Structure formats: C-alpha cells, structure tokens
Design a protein around this ligand. Structure first.
Ligand SMILES: NC(=O)c1ccc[n+]([C@@H]2O[C@H](COP(=O)([O-])OP(=O)(O)OC[C@H]3O[C@@H](n4cnc5c(N)ncnc54)[C@H](OP(=O)(O)O)[C@@H]3O)[C@@H](O)[C@H]2O)c1
Length: 326
C-alpha cells in the first residue's frame, strides 16, 4: 500500500464534476465468462473508484454485478462514490441509437446514470437490424460519411442525455485537434474529456496541450503502452531500459512510473489488467520526483512515436493517415 498514492487525486472537469485521476480499464478482449467480474471486483477492493467501460467490450453485465456485489458487501461505500464511464460504438452514432446505447449500458451496469459518457470514435458506421456492426463486401465497416464528417446530430444526442441527467458529463475518445475544433463550433456543451492513447512511446503532446489549453481534460488509455511489442522494431515499452532505469533507481515498478508520469503531466490514466497482483499494484501511483519525471520525458523525446491502437484495417477508414514513409 502507498499512503501517498495519487489514487486519492481527482481532476475537475469543465462542468465541475470531479474525476478520479486513476481509473481501471475493464477491456477483456479475450474472455472469459467471469473474468471481468473478478477483475472489476479486485479493482474496487483495491481502492479504485473510477471504472472505464464500453459497449464494445460486451462485458458491462459482469461489471454491473461487480459494482452491485461490492456495494452490498461494503455498506459504507455509496454508488455516488464511484465514477463510471461508458461509451457508444461506431455503428450507433445515429441520435436514437446513441440514446439506445446508453440505455442498454445503464441496464447492464445496473445503474441509473453514468458519470461519463463518450463517443468512442469520431467514425460513424452502418448497423444491422439487430444493432450489430454491418460488414461490407470487403468485410469492413460500412462508413456513413455524412454522419462522420458532420457529427452534430450525434453530439446533440449526447447533449440531450447530459441534460436528462443520464450522464453527469459527456466527452469524446480518439478525437483529433481538428476534430475538436469542428465540434467546438457546433457544440452547446463542450466535451469534458478526450480519451486518447497516451504513453512514453506516444506522448501525444500537441493534442494533450491543445486539450488542456481548451478546457478538455485528456484521459489516457494504454498508459502502460501495451505489451503489443512495437511492430517495425520488435521492442516492448515495458522492456525499455531508460524507462526501467528510472523505476529501478526509485524502488517503484515500471508501471507505477509510467502511471505517475501521466498524472504528473495533468491527465487521467486508465491502466488495464486481469491479474490481481497487477490490479493492486497499479493503484499505487507515486508523485514523481523532478528528476524521475524529466528522465522519463527523455525516453519519450528520444524516439519516433508509435501508435499501438489503429483500427484502420477493421474500419476501412483511416483517421490518423499515418504511413511507413512520409
Ligand atoms: N479507443 C478507446 O477509448 C480505448 C482503447 C483502448 C483501451 N481503452 C481503455 O484503457 C485501458 C488500457 O488499454 P490497454 O490494455 O491496451 O493498455 P495498458 O493499460 O497500458 O496495459 C496493457 C497491459 O499491460 C499489462 N499490465 C498491467 N499492469 C501491469 C503491471 N504493473 N506490470 C506489468 N504489466 C502490466 C497487463 O496484462 P494482464 O492483463 O495480463 O495483467 C495489460 O494487459 C482499456 O482497458 C480500456 O478501458 C480505451
């Protein structure tokens, strides 16, 4: 346990809502039945008060039971003490489908409201009659270009959910700087959060700066970089000697140093794990010294950025227009 952990720290969103600086990522892209329940339960017991969820991962039902069981077991804690975030997927950007998606997520989570609701990608795709992702003849998402280029109808729907008090704050995920500029023009409620990939191999500094300078708070998914192993070089973030040197010299884990780096930059961090030992350890986020903070920055600044999450090939849509050359 870390008495000085920054797990007690919150940020204040531009509408006054407080968001815990550390949240637990619940994505379980590989099963099993019951694994999300155990992990979520472990996070709640370990002191997490921020849970990050999404319709896409199809496990909000297990999360709902975990929250309900945790609350039943711990009468001193109230649902209001938890910060719950979920997200609407790309095939559900039509206004009525946005509301349906939150209603569905609220049902599975066994909640009356969520603390944060996000548009998961700035990409609108067609859906099937039964509200699944419609696949085109190449097997990729079928893109609705009108709704993708002019997301106003989708955002109005988020605004209405927010005014209906079904979401205490609304935000975006994977939005770009230009995307934010376009949204600001048509938005009555400014997005409170932009959840994006942020870690030492992808510092995303220009977007992080633009958000902070504009009252949008970033939150970092993949804050540990994934163990996904950089594809053009075959190196892992968690094998990086510079990063490990800072952690080792300060008797902290590599993950804790990476999470402490993110909060120190001034944004939320959403570490994911299925492993109890790692769930427990990742809630112990240190307040980094100036030397540690700077040296991690040296690693980040000494290399070419590498984005681990790019669903180009699945979507049949290229948001970030990144190539081998150029
Ligand atoms: N488009 C979006 O909005 C989006 C995209 C991706 C993710 N997210 C959210 O953010 C979360 C993070 O995504 P991510 O899993 O790709 O990256 P991550 O949080 O940076 O961590 C990925 C992997 O690191 C391992 N790990 C965790 N703690 C560790 C520790 N102390 N020491 C060593 N290894 C550790 C874990 O493996 P084990 O599981 O085996 O323990 C975990 O799978 C997701 O769950 C999700 O809620 C959002």
């Amino acid at each position: 346990m870390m008495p000085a952990t920054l797990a007690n720290k919150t940020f204040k969103l531009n509408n006054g809502v407080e968001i815990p600086a550390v949240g637990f990522g619940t994505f379980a892209a590989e099963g099993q039945p019951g694994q999300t329940y155990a992990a979520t339960k472990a996070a709640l017991e370990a002191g997490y008060r921020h849970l990050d969820c999404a319709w896409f991962y199809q496990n909000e039902d297990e999360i709902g039971n975990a929250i309900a069981d945790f609350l039943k077991e711990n009468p001193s804690v109230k649902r209001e003490d938890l910060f719950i975030c979920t997200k609407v997927w790309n095939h559900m950007h039509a206004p009525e489908d946005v509301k349906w998606s939150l209603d569905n997520s609220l049902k599975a989570l066994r909640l009356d409201y969520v603390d944060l609701f996000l548009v998961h990608w700035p990409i609108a795709a067609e859906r099937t009659e039964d509200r699944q992702v419609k696949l085109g003849p190449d097997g990729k998402y079928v893109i609705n270009h009108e709704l993708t280029e002019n997301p106003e109808p989708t955002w109005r729907a988020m605004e209405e959910l927010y005014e209906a008090k079904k979401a205490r704050a609304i935000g975006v995920s994977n939005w770009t700087i230009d995307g934010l500029k376009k949204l600001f023009a048509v938005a009555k409620v400014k997005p409170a959060v932009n959840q994006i990939e942020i870690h030492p191999y992808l510092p995303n500094e220009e977007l992080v700066r633009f958000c902070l300078d504009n009252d949008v708070l970033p939150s970092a998914y993949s804050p540990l970089g994934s163990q996904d192993q950089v594809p053009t070089t075959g190196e892992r973030v968690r094998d990086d000697p510079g990063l490990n040197a800072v952690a080792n010299r300060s008797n902290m884990t590599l993950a804790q140093a990476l999470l402490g780096w993110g909060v120190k930059r001034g944004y939320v961090v959403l570490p994911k794990s299925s492993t109890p030992s790692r769930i427990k350890s990742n809630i112990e986020v240190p307040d980094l010294s100036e030397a540690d903070y700077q040296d991690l920055w040296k690693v980040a600044n000494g290399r070419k950025p590498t984005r681990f999450v790019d669903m180009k090939d699945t979507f049949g849509y290229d948001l970030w227009k990144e190539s081998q050359l150029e």
